[PDB]
Motif scaffolding. Structure first.
Motif, PDB file in Angstrom:
ATOM      1  N   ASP A   1       0.873  -1.185   0.000  1.00  0.00           N
ATOM      2  CA  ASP A   1       0.000   0.000   0.000  1.00  0.00           C
ATOM      3  C   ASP A   1       0.920   1.249   0.000  1.00  0.00           C
ATOM      4  O   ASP A   1       2.147   1.110   0.138  1.00  0.00           O
ATOM      5  CB  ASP A   1      -0.933  -0.035   1.245  1.00  0.00           C
ATOM      6  N   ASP A   2       0.352   2.453  -0.173  1.00  0.00           N
ATOM      7  CA  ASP A   2       1.131   3.710  -0.115  1.00  0.00           C
ATOM      8  C   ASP A   2       1.854   3.833   1.259  1.00  0.00           C
ATOM      9  O   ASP A   2       1.218   3.671   2.308  1.00  0.00           O
ATOM     10  CB  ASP A   2       0.200   4.925  -0.371  1.00  0.00           C
ATOM     11  N   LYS A   3       3.195   4.049   1.213  1.00  0.00           N
ATOM     12  CA  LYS A   3       4.107   4.236   2.396  1.00  0.00           C
ATOM     13  C   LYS A   3       4.005   3.126   3.497  1.00  0.00           C
ATOM     14  O   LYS A   3       4.529   3.297   4.607  1.00  0.00           O
ATOM     15  CB  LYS A   3       3.981   5.686   2.998  1.00  0.00           C
TER      16      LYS A   3
END
Length: 136
Positions: free
Chosen positions: A41-43
Motif C-alpha cells: 500500500d502507499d508508504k
C-alpha cells in the motif's frame, strides 16, 4: 547494556546491479526472495504468509538505492530499525553494500561470524551465497 550501531559491508560483483536490495522497496521485488507473499500500500508494506498472521511496516526514508529504511507499525520507536545502502564504484564496477544493524556485545560475536562468513564466501563463490540466517 546498550545496543551498538554496526554497518556491515558486503563486496558484490560488477555482474550484480542496484536492483538486488532496491527490490525491497516494491511488492513484486520483495516477495521474489522474502516471505510467501508481499501485498503493498502507499508508504506501508503488508507481508502475508498463509492468510493467518499478516504484518505491516512503514518506510522512514529512501532515495533510489543510496539508502532505504524500514520500521514496523507495531514497533513505532524502540530497536527494530534496519537500513540498507549500496554505492556504484565507477573506478572498478563492483558495489559496496552497507547494512546498519543494532547488536549487544554478546550478539556482535554472531554478527562478526556473519561478517567473515559472508565477506570471504562472496569471493570464493564469485557473486552471492546467503548465510545471514533469519534471527529476529
Amino acid at each position: 547494556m546498550k545496543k551498538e550501531k554496526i554497518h556491515l559491508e558486503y563486496l558484490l560483483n560488477a555482474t550484480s546491479k542496484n536492483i538486488l536490495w532496491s527490490a525491497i522497496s516494491t511488492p513484486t521485488g520483495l516477495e521474489d526472495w522474502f516471505a510467501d507473499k508481499v501485498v503493498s500500500d502507499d508508504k506501508t508494506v503488508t507481508f502475508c504468509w498463509g492468510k493467518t498472521e499478516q504484518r505491516q511496516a512503514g518506510i522512514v526514508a529512501i532515495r533510489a538505492y543510496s539508502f532505504i529504511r524500514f520500521h514496523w507499525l507495531d514497533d513505532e520507536n524502540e530497536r527494530d530499525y534496519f537500513e540498507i545502502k549500496m554505492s556504484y564504484n565507477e573506478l572498478t564496477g563492483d558495489y559496496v553494500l552497507e547494512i546498519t544493524d543494532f547488536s549487544e556485545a554478546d550478539e556482535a560475536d554472531d554478527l562478526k561470524e556473519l561478517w567473515d562468513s559472508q565477506v570471504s564466501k562472496l569471493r570464493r563463490t564469485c557473486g552471492f551465497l546467503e548465510h545471514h540466517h533469519h534471527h529476529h
